[PDB]
Amino acid sequence: TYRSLGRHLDFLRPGLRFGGSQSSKYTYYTVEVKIDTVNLPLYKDSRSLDPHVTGTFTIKNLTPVLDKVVTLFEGYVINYNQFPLCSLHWPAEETLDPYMAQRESDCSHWKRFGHFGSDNWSLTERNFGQYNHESAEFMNQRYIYLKWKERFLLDDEEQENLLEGASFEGFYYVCLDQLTGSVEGYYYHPACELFQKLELVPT
């Protein structure tokens, strides 16, 4: 009859702050991420289609004029089952369309974090060959993989609403280290074969 309330993780819980940078050859910005809600996909029911994470981005001094730019983001957690590493095997619900990418994109981006074994990689398998009979469940592995996408502009981090050009088209591949709290990310834009790099630690 009843459904699980889920769990919160030491480094994936409401109220948690991270700080760091987003950078690339021509970009460097100080950024802060705050986790607002968590609904980990521990099982498959209706709630597992709702966002698994919601939070805010804050960019410091985006323009010479704007000292604080704040966006609201939503995201989903890889659990290798209903939400495998290959986004194209995600459920067919339309609200997940903004998180899709080609198989090779997902594959290369997940690999680039550098925490997978060297063995058994296949572009045609729903977890790219990285989740097997002897793998631990996602919450019990050291590294957790997520996809984040911003979808609203806000005024302050207290969250009132005030994003549709090309500079908003992609999404973040995200990797959390549960042992140290460090967070790495790649902002991927479909139409450009370069990314931006997100690096955060807990505040």
Partner 1 sequence: FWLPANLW
User: Do 46 and 82 form a contact (C-beta atoms < 8 A)?
Assistant: no
Chosen residue from 25, 117, 124, 132 binding partner 1 by CB under 8 A: 25
Chosen residue from 12, 56, 196, 200 binding partner 1 by CB under 8 A: 196
- Residue 41 interacts with, from Cl ion, partner 1, none (CB under 5-8 Å by kind): none
How many C-alpha atoms does 113 have within 13 Å on its Cβ side?
A: 26
- Residue 126 interacts with, from partner 1, Cl ion, none (CB under 5-8 Å by kind): Cl ion
The verdict on 168 binding partner 1 (CB under 8 A) reads: yes
The verdict on 169 binding partner 1 (CB under 8 A) reads: yes
The letter for the amino acid at 196 is Q
- Rounded distance, CA 35 to CA 189, Å? 23
The verdict on 126 binding Cl ion (CB under 5 A) reads: yes
How many C-alpha atoms does 162 have within 13 Å on its Cβ side?
A: 13
The letter for the amino acid at 39 is N
| # of chain residues touching partner 1 (CB under 8 A) | 19
Q: Specify the DSSP element, H or E, that contains 31.
A: strand 27-38
- Segment near partner 1 (CB under 8 A), from 3-11, 32-40, 82-90, 159-167? 159-167
